[PDB]
Amino acid sequence: PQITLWKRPLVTIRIGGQLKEALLDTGADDTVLEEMNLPGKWKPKMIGGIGGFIKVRQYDQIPIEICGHKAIGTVLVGPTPVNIIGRNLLTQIGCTLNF
Amino acid sequence: PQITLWKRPLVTIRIGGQLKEALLDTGADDTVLEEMNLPGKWKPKMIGGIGGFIKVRQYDQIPIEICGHKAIGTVLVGPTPVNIIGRNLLTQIGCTLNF
């Protein structure tokens, strides 16, 4: 799809059999979801944004289907204000900016 | 142009006599620039992200040039680590996400 930006670029994602709304965020290096359970081992990590740093849980090699397109990669879980799909997965689904 | 997301989508913008480097950010509703002493009236505001909130100064109707495309809109000025081009200006320069 082509997506314009007069509205937030929110999309439905599928992760672990569950449907969620997430924001396509070219300003995010990483993919960060609100608090949820995912299987397998995680590592504690810290990420920084506009308001400072937070602690997250890092899950590697996680399948997410974003708007029909499959990715498998790193998903961070922690106190983000919103579910965000970052560049690590946007690249896997072939997402570019265009103007 | 077309911009891939292997690295941060940074581009040159112009505001007054300042050429700057800024992030094309589909996840930002608003445009947020690093501290700078713009002329004019402003209103105080709070914006939130990862880590929490920062205080900014909202300036209205500020011409900005983004990769040779002209825009004019609201700009928020405060202690962001990076210059952020938000949806309010990305729409003006014809910017879309495509995959």
Ligand SMILES: COc1cccc(S(=O)(=O)N(Cc2cccs2)C[C@@H](O)[C@H](Cc2ccccc2)NC(=O)c2cccc(F)c2C)c1
């Ligand atoms: C009114 O609210 C806003 C207006 C403009 C920008 C922002 S923002 O905080 O910068 N933010 C909104 C968010 C959406 C979801 C989580 S945070 C935009 C987001 O793209 C910000 C932009 C940014 C980049 C670098 C340094 C600071 C900030 N990115 C990140 O927070 C970020 C950075 C690195 C990794 C990561 F996972 C994330 C989510 C908020």
